[PDB]
Write a protein that binds this DNA or RNA. Sequence first.
RNA 1: GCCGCG
Lengths: 149, 147, 248, 49, 235, 308, 49
Amino acid sequence: VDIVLNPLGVPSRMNIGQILETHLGMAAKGIGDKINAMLKQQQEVAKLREFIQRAYDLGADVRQKVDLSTFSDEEVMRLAENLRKGMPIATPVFDGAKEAEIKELLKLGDLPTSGQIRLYDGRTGEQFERPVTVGYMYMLKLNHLVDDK
Amino acid sequence: DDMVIPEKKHEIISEAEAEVAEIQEQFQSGLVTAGERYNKVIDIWAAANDRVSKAMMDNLQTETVINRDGQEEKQVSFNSIYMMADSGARGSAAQIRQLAGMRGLMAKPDGSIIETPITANFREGLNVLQYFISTHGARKGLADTAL
Amino acid sequence: RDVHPTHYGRVCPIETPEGPNIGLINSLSVYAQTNEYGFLETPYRKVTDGVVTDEIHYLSAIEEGNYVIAQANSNLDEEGHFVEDLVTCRSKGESSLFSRDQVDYMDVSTQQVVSVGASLIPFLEHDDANRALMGANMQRQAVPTLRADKPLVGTGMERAVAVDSGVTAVAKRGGVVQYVDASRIVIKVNEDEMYPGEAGIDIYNLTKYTRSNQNTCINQMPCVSLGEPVERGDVLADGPSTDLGELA
Amino acid sequence: NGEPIIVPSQDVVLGLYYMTRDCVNAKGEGMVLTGPKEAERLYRSGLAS
Amino acid sequence: SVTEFLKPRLVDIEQVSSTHAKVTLEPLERGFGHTLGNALRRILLSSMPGCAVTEVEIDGVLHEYSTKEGVQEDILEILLNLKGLAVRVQGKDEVILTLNKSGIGPVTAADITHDGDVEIVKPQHVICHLTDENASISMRIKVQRGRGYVPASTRIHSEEDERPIGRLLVDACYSPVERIAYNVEAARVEQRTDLDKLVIEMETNGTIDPEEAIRRAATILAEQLEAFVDLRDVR
Amino acid sequence: EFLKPRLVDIEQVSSTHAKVTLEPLERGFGHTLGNALRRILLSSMPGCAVTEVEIDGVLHEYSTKEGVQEDILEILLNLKGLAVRVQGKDEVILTLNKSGIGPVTAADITHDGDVEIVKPQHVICHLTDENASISMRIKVQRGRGYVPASTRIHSEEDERPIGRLLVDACYSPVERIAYNVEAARVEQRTDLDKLVIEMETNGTIDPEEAIRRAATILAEQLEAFVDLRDVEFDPILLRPVDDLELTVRSANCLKAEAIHYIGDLVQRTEVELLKTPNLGKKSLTEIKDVLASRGLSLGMRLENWPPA
Amino acid sequence: DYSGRSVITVGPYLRLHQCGLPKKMALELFKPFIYGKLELRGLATTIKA
RNA sequence: GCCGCG
């Protein structure tokens, strides 16, 4: 992992957006990893288009209707090379991803639907007793630095 | 998934809505003035909140049912959020009630209380209206703490 | 410095400074504008009979008080009618359940309440109002990094912020890109649109490393490579903390 | 008030609470130990919970 | 430059009693203290040769729960007491010992029969304070050399329950390490400041000096790598 | 009484991925060896990295070059991820000269004597003007761990020309290490474990060589456990007094008071030095005058006094 | 005078009576003490040195 | 005078 955060800051502050964004980032990076894998082994285009269509055809009655049939091969390859790091999925403010959509997005990426994986200690090698919530959260660096303080 | 919403929440919400519809028609009959029906609706919503929170604590406290060498027993849950609240490390029953049970009846435009409460917790989303209600209280609290 | 029930679609309830100025400084919502006189107005969709039409009326604070206004997340059928008979509404600074033929206006979208700053927080509806306030006020202090990295979990308002903020380079008569450099972009305008005489090409001079007011760096790097067709309104270079015309 | 003010908070309380708890069935049940040192050896090497 | 790593200098030892030691090493390259401490602890706790009692037999009552004929100490406490006694066997794998006593007075480990190959390090360690008042108590134990720690999960020996009843399934603690703990701290030399300092706290049941224990663990872990260091050797 | 693991069935998934198998291991040694090896591999493995760059028409990292699409900072960031191998040299200089259109890749680096480019499809910059050329000199060194360009100050001993761009150095070939323990195929033994280590590098280091080096490092570190045992400076001082050119009458009195070094003299306060025999008030000024002629005022305090 | 200010981070390796002070924040709070030690050790005779 | 930080 890159960042380790304290869970005790979640329940007393009531940021469940933290956890939902973490799970959604894990699902998006799972899809990105799948795309990057199918791109690494030089898989033929049609299966890549079908997988990307399946990823974009998800959700329960979503108004986005992106169809790759109208896309030629070159633009699809360029888009897939652009989605290698992850699928930049978006949720509008008050009508965004639901629980079922997040869980099924995780399922499509071959990740545990619970959003928690098994973490091994980096110093002793022992597995942590409980599963740990791991994902991808989008962090910012504020202007308040000790160089000026 | 560590915030287990009780399964009977929709049932108690339905009973509360049925009772408020009955009191609405009873008011329409004209035998009750505005003050009595307002007080009664606040009372029933508060009772529903109490029962929802009690059900959520009941389902979260001993959620574990782990078998033993003989048959199966029931013991204290190892849910992380309950483990945080019970240990006293962080959080209390009110915040767990906001997280899993219904957010509760709340209002502070001038100190008054609105008839319909926020029925949605933080695990599920809040509608635009419910968030706009919660903003009044949050703003008043922040200003009071500042001043 | 409190939140008045008429603040709904005009002034953001979340974004405001914390300590001294709370409630005294606000931000307009995404859709709010000003009347001919100067009062804040907000869009709404008319309702005729039981259907929800598409014509948009901008209502002020006074006018909205007498109409019965629906909610953004009200289910609809294909014909535009309301799926359920009794829907939520705001009548006179309050909210209640009303019949399907009694409503007079409907919310245009679900971002009407929140400002541009607070409409960038994914899963805002799962956040406490005060924590959401701190997050919105804290997004504005982020420092642009060496390399912009798009948000894996966004909202979709990032394209709007990046394009309309003016930091990026946006085409105005986009044709076909002719020359690309880490400093300049030269585009040959397609013949379909052309001012007669003297032909015409478009040259965008990117602003390289330049200090900002807060002593950060303002930098623009091209997004197009060569011979790549470009349409009007596309982004050519992304400024500080922007990835492919999307706020990062 | 006289109550101690340097007291464990947050993560320390969580650790102390997680350590001193019991579950009905785990690795090791009714097993007899000669002292706390054997308990630590059993936990760390993984023969007990 | 490369291939050259910092080697700990002026190893510090604080001997406590005769079985408690605290060994400090400084300096080590960053992140090496944790590696060495973890590896040493794991192989000291999980796999170390040693001998500890495994089977017991008390004439008379042979059930797991027994009246103990009034020996003022439940047989569970007897098993706990004989678990901790440490022995040294030389040239033999399994060995039988017998203790028979009568007359008022506690039975210590010294009062068992003495064999030449068996060298018991805590003879004053008490099994119990005899039967109440006076009576004859006779027992026969069997101890075998093993590795690490193995609990009495099951017998799986002989046939039916003959081995259990003749053994009573005492937990075996073969490894002669009562407690191992390691702590890794910040230490520095010259301009370098992100260096690692290792502190190892060891307590042994006996039969082994803690320094000898650490040396044996280091020996086995290093000679576990001879398949990769033999050809790739400076000398 | 212990079995010794032997490196068998080393299998190469791709030019970057690798799997290394150790067949015979005891009950619990699998996890111990796995974690020790993984920590050693991720911590310290010798590798080669770009340390500095020098483009022809560049002056600093925050400039632009005409005809190239990427900024100089982007070019440096691309060069940082370039991986090389060198045999017997640690100070290699690679020249890159390319004029034309399209990308410039590591493949068009001028072929040195023994400098292996692992991936020659690693693009580093683009050229967009037809009559535009890129010419640069890249320095590659051999190191052990991450070393920022800012921390190295020893290189500032000799002045650097304006244009020598410093990039950070990674020096570590190994990117990802994982391991697993399964049951062995050894049927005559009661129960044996087999360890498998999967490695992902930049293609620089051979997997077998990497595991061998890590094992060597671990054994070398453990070698210190197998045998525990172990159970007035500033040059103006410390000089003879016969360099201040005192007076004749002051020669005997200083010797009479056993003052034979300059340092011991400066510790004698005025109030007691006047009590010395036949010192002379005017002669007391003379010694102060010549002592102040070197920057030492009489009456300092030191901490010790060696015989030298 | 003889005072400084900086951001606080958590050090769990400390004791109850210890704090962490940057070497740059020191050598500036403790300048006269360091001058005295330099002069007393004979390293720098004059205060200018 | 304004803005922000706890």
